[PDB]
Amino acid sequence: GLMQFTLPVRLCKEIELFHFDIGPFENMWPGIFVYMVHRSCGTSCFELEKLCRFIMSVKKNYRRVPYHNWKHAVTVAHCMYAILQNNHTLFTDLERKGLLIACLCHDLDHRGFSNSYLQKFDHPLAALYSTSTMEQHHFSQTVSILQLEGHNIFSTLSSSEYEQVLEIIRKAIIATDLALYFGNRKQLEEMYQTGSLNLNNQSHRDRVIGLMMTACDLCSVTKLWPVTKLTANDIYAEFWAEGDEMKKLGIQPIPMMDRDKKDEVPQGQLGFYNAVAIPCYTTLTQILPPTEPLLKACRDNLSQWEKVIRGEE
Ligand SMILES: Cn1cc(NC(=O)c2nc(C3CC3)ccc2Nc2cncnc2)c(C(=O)NCC(C)(C)O)n1
Ligand SMILES: [Mg+2]
Ligand SMILES: [Zn+2]
């Protein structure tokens, strides 16, 4: 209770910023996450012994893949921290509790392959879950660990408040199916612009929380260039591995996933920045102005990709 986590000065300062990198020291990441919970939610939110045992079970059940790993899970959790600490009054006590835990669990048990490859491989999870195949599997994993003994971190909530938070976490983990981002944003764009957006409307809240979960998920496009550039390599290591497996089924993969098509990558990032990221953060700023720094960071990294095409690097 009187046991505050304190980070070295550089981290203490640099963790409040949006563009923070959580560093290459794995064993610090659980402390970082706990520091973030305590400042974002409170020292009372979670029994510190149940939290630490949860955190380390979640860590155990992320795999050793290049991108969709334990570092991603913590990275995404930080971007959510940053948003909440810059939107102090807007979000309920349960929302702050739920969301940080959703982000840490969003990609639980990721294999390094998309929903499309699970379908075309005819994987069992495709049979169980036709749409948002992995994201439903992720949430299934979270629920499984929450229920392990000495892991129920929400044991002080009422039966209703506990259903509330698992629903927040369910919607939040499904939201990270990018195939749902497009319509969700498009519906928030109109609502803002026609001025019918209303944060007391709980169907609108689910949408805005949906945007926050994309924003956080893609937040490697919102780092300083050297972190974004280097994380590109990790994401494309999963992409090219999946295309290898697409080739293996007798399917010529989309250039993105074809490791013979590395020349096309800069342009592919443009199309991604213009098509998915700039619009994601634009629409997020319009709803949550103090998230502007994610847009600024995104655009800077958009410019660095133009500069790579122009040969200046
Ligand atoms: C050519 N191309 C690249 C794509 N995606 C990515 O490059 C990308 N995806 C994600 C996850 C999925 C959200 C996260 C980071 C990413 N890049 C990145 C850059 N720098 C640092 N870290 C990460 C797409 C794409 O998915 N289009 C959308 C579809 C293909 C679904 O239409 N198309
Ligand atoms: Mg995912
Ligand atoms: Zn993710």
CATH number of the domain that 156 lies in?
Answer: 1.10.1300.10
Residue 8: inside a domain, yes or no?
no
How is residue 127 written in tokens?
Answer: 């049979």
Residue 23 is assigned to a structural domain of this protein: no
Q: Please indicate, yes or no, if residue 1 is contained in any of the structural domains.
A: no
Identify whether 15 is part of a domain: no
Nearest Cα to Cα of residue 266 among 233, 297, 230, 309: 309
Cβ-in-10-Å burial (0-12, 13-18, 19+) of 14 comes to: middle
Closest CA to ligand 1's atom 17: 232
Domain range for residue 93?
28-310
DSSP for 55-96, please give it.
Answer: HHHHHHTS---SSSSHHHHHHHHHHHHHHHHTSTTTS-HHHH
Q: Supply the DSSP string of 258-272, one letter for each residue.
A: -TT--TTHHHHHHHH
Give domain status of residue 14, yes or no: no
Q: What method did the depositors use to determine the structure?
A: X-ray
Residue 21 inside a domain? The answer is no
Q: Say how many C-beta atoms besides its own lie within 10 A of residue 130's C-beta.
A: 10
68 assigned binding-site residue? yes
Q: What SS3 class is residue 184?
A: helix
Output helix, strand, coil percentages for the chain, rounded to the nearest 5.
Answer: 70, 0, 30
Regarding the beta carbon of 235 and ligand 1, being less than 6 Å apart is answered yes
In a domain, 292, yes or no: yes
Residue 154 lies in a domain: yes
Q: Is the C-beta atom of 218 inside 6 A of ligand 1?
A: yes
Candidate list 19, 68, 78, 137, residue with the active-site label: 68
- Please tell me the total count of domains within the chain: 1
Report which secondary-structure segment, H or E, holds 8: none
Taking the C-alpha atoms of residue 263 and residue 261, their distance in angstroms, rounded to an integer, is: 6
CA 69 to the chain's CA centroid: 11
